[PDB]
Design an enzyme around this catalytic site. Structure first.
Site, PDB file in Angstrom:
ATOM      1  N   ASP A  44       0.839  -1.194   0.000  1.00 44.37           N
ATOM      2  CA  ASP A  44       0.000   0.000   0.000  1.00 44.37           C
ATOM      3  C   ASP A  44       0.876   1.247   0.000  1.00 44.37           C
ATOM      4  OD1 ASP A  44      -2.706   1.571   1.110  1.00 44.37           O
ATOM      5  OD2 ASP A  44      -0.879   2.173   2.191  1.00 44.37           O
ATOM      6  N   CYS A 137     -13.110   0.971  -4.707  1.00 45.32           N
ATOM      7  CA  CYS A 137     -12.769   1.270  -3.300  1.00 45.32           C
ATOM      8  C   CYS A 137     -12.743   2.763  -3.166  1.00 45.32           C
ATOM      9  CB  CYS A 137     -11.461   0.590  -2.918  1.00 45.32           C
ATOM     10  SG  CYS A 137     -10.119   1.724  -2.886  1.00 45.32           S
ATOM     11  N   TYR A 141     -14.463  -1.521   0.457  1.00 49.64           N
ATOM     12  CA  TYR A 141     -14.090  -1.311   1.855  1.00 49.64           C
ATOM     13  C   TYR A 141     -15.283  -0.924   2.755  1.00 49.64           C
ATOM     14  CZ  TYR A 141      -9.130  -2.284   1.290  1.00 49.64           C
ATOM     15  OH  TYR A 141      -7.923  -2.928   1.063  1.00 49.64           O
ATOM     16  N   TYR A 167     -13.826   2.083   8.216  1.00 44.87           N
ATOM     17  CA  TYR A 167     -14.300   2.049   6.838  1.00 44.87           C
ATOM     18  C   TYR A 167     -15.820   2.131   6.705  1.00 44.87           C
ATOM     19  CZ  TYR A 167      -9.498   1.219   5.335  1.00 44.87           C
ATOM     20  OH  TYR A 167      -8.153   1.365   5.080  1.00 44.87           O
ATOM     21  N   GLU A 208      -8.982  -6.042  -5.926  1.00 45.44           N
ATOM     22  CA  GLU A 208      -9.070  -5.927  -4.458  1.00 45.44           C
ATOM     23  C   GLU A 208      -8.974  -7.274  -3.756  1.00 45.44           C
ATOM     24  OE1 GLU A 208      -8.571  -3.566  -2.673  1.00 45.44           O
ATOM     25  OE2 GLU A 208      -8.987  -1.840  -3.993  1.00 45.44           O
TER      26      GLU A 208
END
EC number: 3.5.99.2
Lengths: 225, 225, 224, 225
Positions: A44, A137, A141, A167, A208
């Site tokens: 990430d 996303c 999420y 989230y 994802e």
């Protein structure tokens, strides 16, 4: 119906398959080991500056300067640091977020995700293609978080549940903005054109799931044997 | 000398011709006509969206995050829409700036300038080529205004001089940013590449002369023969 | 050594992994299933238009007009058919080639390969990256097929060995071209840059393995 | 009427001006001299590679493979040399083509035209923008040369007449291909989009007028004052 909702309906079996996959399930019941979570963070962080670059590539695709303002803000937010869901993951492993990411990873999955978004921003004039590519996303999420709170298999004792709390709320802003743009842009597009966009969206949706399976499997390029 | 100082050196003969051309001259004496000021603002305002685009395209070419923040400011400054020098030119014609730019014009000279800059952004990987295309915009203006301060032909009774006073100071900070980027990037480059870069910078100098002149001549596409 | 040999030296383990994966081993013995040949033919024909585009995108990046004359010819080649390796493979399924490719397929593996290549054509000025990204294709196919000729496992009593005979020979011209290009471009480049070019090269090597593996596994996007 | 004819009809007053301008008139009478011819040949050769690149960039924007087979053919013809009109011109300057183009020049008028076609090729997904930017070249030459055949000032005693005789025929195939691509592609488009395509085409017509002019005036970038 509305176009962005047509996307959401098609995305259901995938978010379903993501929810029952190993990352989400393990985050849910608190049993997820700090090794998998390390892989997820380092990647990430590594793809950070790529996301920054995609928002800036969206700007010449805009028209309204109100939408340009927003892209600046999202670029602003990422460079400004302050990743809250990341420190909750930093807590579970028990080492600081910045120390973990001093090492970085560029796994074949993240690579596949990043180039899918970049293909849209390089090859396609209409913004909707880049936007559909980055939308899955936090929509995914958010929808995972809401399936968590209603679920009685949710473990609230651990620091895994504070991830899901994040989230549920804090992704909801940019979902609406992306939803506005996509819905506005689809009005003039044909059914054949729109099928492509949907495919763009759903490929990202898979990315994802593959990104979480990447974290769980400690995935990398194997060049050495 | 530093690479960007060689660029300034080369730019002198052009900056001179510009100073002696009717636009600035008629700006000095303060007798210039609302005709040309109207054309000038209209062209510039139509190219507003295009310059926002160029700062966006430079972001993925930036390897340093402090450089990205700089480009972000320029977009925000363009989104906020505070044009000081423009409001000065407006009152001389005697209409508000929004009325004037309600009508836009898109002249050949300006078309060539824009397309020159986009050519760098689009086809040149190294951020030095786009920057070098953009730099002769805040440098030339500062240099002319600085010349006019020591010039006895400058009419200080007229409001046109407030335009000059604006450009002798307010451009300084962005010049140095372009100056540091250009000098930094030229370090790793072959002498022959720098001969290309220099060429790119010099054409922009020429387009600045042509832009001013386009406003004096009320230039446009004539497709009607 | 030359830069391109350095690429070939690093590509070895990967090439070996490909040779020992299921596609080549079952290609050797003759026993490869028709499901996989089917998927391989369709995925390859779906991505044909993309390969056309990539050579085309390399043209502005060229300098010499002889390099251009080459890129032109490869597209002029790709237009026509002359898909003889595929003509052979379709006999094994028993359907005609044109009949098989009537339904194209667009697997996630191919998708990742294609986009990796395009990324170079879109974001990198210097041709060497886009060439590095496409180079593993002829070179890998060639190597594996060369290996098959010294390999006793290969069933010469099955039609599948005609595949290896083709690829032991017919890629050799295009490999040299590519080899010249990379070697000539690398002369002017730093060690850091070439570290990126090598990484681009090795990824397509991996993409090559996944391409094969995908035909075996009938890979696709599962949206449902 | 078909879309390309709307284009052809709008081009008329610009074609007529080009016919009446010094280059074509002096080409007509045969009194055009080596200076301008040399400069025309030099600029033209210098831009070859670029006009060659553009055909290549039309490929990924092509739908069928017959449109690709044509494009390939064009690049195939530019690689092979064989410039008949250029050799006619070189005879008049009294030298060989290869000698004349040993020295190349990239004048402002040429630069603007090139950057106009490339802007279309880099920023516009739809093929029609790039083709419309390239369509005026062959078409204009054709029309010019056909008009000379009925013109009694055409000097048949000088080889300049062979220059027109060539363009009176040898551009027709490619004009017709481009005409088919533009008509076909326009069908799916809104009237608003077509107004922009027409603007590109006409902009290219003007560029043609300036290219001839640049040759008569021995145009160059003036950096020295």
């Amino acid at each position: 119906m509305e176009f962005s909702q047509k996307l959401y309906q098609a995305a259901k079996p995938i978010i379903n398959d993501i929810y029952e996959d190993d990352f989400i399930q393990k985050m849910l019941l608190g049993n997820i080991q700090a090794d998998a979570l390390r892989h997820y963070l380092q990647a990430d962080a590594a793809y950070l500056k790529e996301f920054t670059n995609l928002y800036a590539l969206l700007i010449p695709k805009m028209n309204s300067m109100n939408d340009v303002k927003f892209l600046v803000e999202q670029i602003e937010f990422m460079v400004e640091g302050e990743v809250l869901a990341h420190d909750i993951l930093a807590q579970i492993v028990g080492e600081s977020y910045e120390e973990i990411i001093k090492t970085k990873v560029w796994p074949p999955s993240g690579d596949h995700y990043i180039k899918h978004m970049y293909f849209q921003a390089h090859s396609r004039e209409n913004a909707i293609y880049t936007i559909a590519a980055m939308a899955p996303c936090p929509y995914i999420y958010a929808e995972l978080a809401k399936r968590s709170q209603s679920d009685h298999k949710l473990n609230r004792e651990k620091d895994t549940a504070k991830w899901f709390d994040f989230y549920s709320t804090e992704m909801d802003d940019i979902i609406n903005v992306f939803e506005s743009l996509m819905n506005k842009l689809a009005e003039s597009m044909s059914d054949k054109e729109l099928e492509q966009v949907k495919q763009v969206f759903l490929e990202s949706c898979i990315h994802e799931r593959r990104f979480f399976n990447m974290a769980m499997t400690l995935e990398q390029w194997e060049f050495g044997g």
